[PDB]
Amino acid sequence: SPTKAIVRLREHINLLSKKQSHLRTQITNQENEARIFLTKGNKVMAKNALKKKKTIEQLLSKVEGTMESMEQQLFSIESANLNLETMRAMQEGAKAMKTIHSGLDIDKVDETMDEIREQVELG
């Protein structure tokens, strides 16, 4: 069911979201270590810290990408659902109007009967 899917996608995004914040935190921490090392020490350590930071960034980009794909799917479903609603309503409105086209124009008992009568008589 569509409702089931929407819930899964939303919950899934939530999880990815939790991960995104964690990843962001790691990125800042690593950058900070790089800053202090540049002071209380050797570059090499700083360079190493930055490289780590980059790989944490690339992983984040992927987390973000999965989220982006998921978000797109939600939009496509939410959009599709609306269209269905439009179609049903449009379908419903046609039925209502049909009952109207009937009205008393078709509810002409004499016209119908005579027609039936002639065919009987016609044999």
Numbering used by the authors: 18 to 140
In the authors' words:
The endosomal sorting complexes required for transport (ESCRTs) are membrane remodeling machinery that mediate diverse fundamental cellular processes, including the biogenesis of multivesicular body (MVB) during receptor down-regulation, enveloped virus budding, cytokinesis, plasma membrane repair, nuclear pore complex assembly, and nuclear envelope reformation. ESCRT-III is a unique protein complex in that it is metastable and conformationally dynamic, forming hetero-oligomeric filaments of multiple subunits on membranes. Vps20 nucleates the homo-oligomerization of the most abundant ESCRT-III subunit, Snf7, which then recruits Vps24 and Vps2. We then crystallized and solved X-ray crystal structures of Snf7core in two conformations at 1.6 Å and 2.4 Å resolutions, respectively.
When we superimposed our Snf7 structure with available ESCRT-III structures, we were surprised to note that Snf7core does not fold into four α-helices, but instead, it contains only three α-helices that pack into a highly elongated structure. Although the α1/2 hairpin is relatively unchanged, α3 and α4 undergo large-scale structural rearrangements from the proposed autoinhibited ESCRT-III fold. α2 extends into a ~90 Å long α-helix combining the α2 and α3 segments that were distinct α-helices in previously defined ESCRT-III structures. The angle of the flexible loop between α3 and α4 also changes, which enables α4 to position in different orientations relative to the α1-3 hairpin. Comparison of our Snf7core crystal structures we determined revealed two distinct conformations. Although both structures exhibit an open conformation, we noted two different orientations of α4 with respect to the α1/2 hairpin. In open conformation A, α4 extends in the protofilament plane, whereas in open conformation B, α4 is positioned perpendicular to the protofilament plane. Superimposing the two conformations revealed that α4 can rotate by at least ~90° along the axis of the α2/3 helix. Despite the large differences in α4 positioning, α4 makes a similar interaction with the α1/2 hairpin of a Snf7 protomer in a neighboring protofilament in both structures. The L121P mutant exhibited a MVB sorting efficiency of 32%, compared to that of the α1/2 loop residue Asn59 mutant N59P of 75%, suggesting that the α3/4 loop functions as an important flexible 'hinge' that may facilitate different architectural stages of Snf7 polymers.
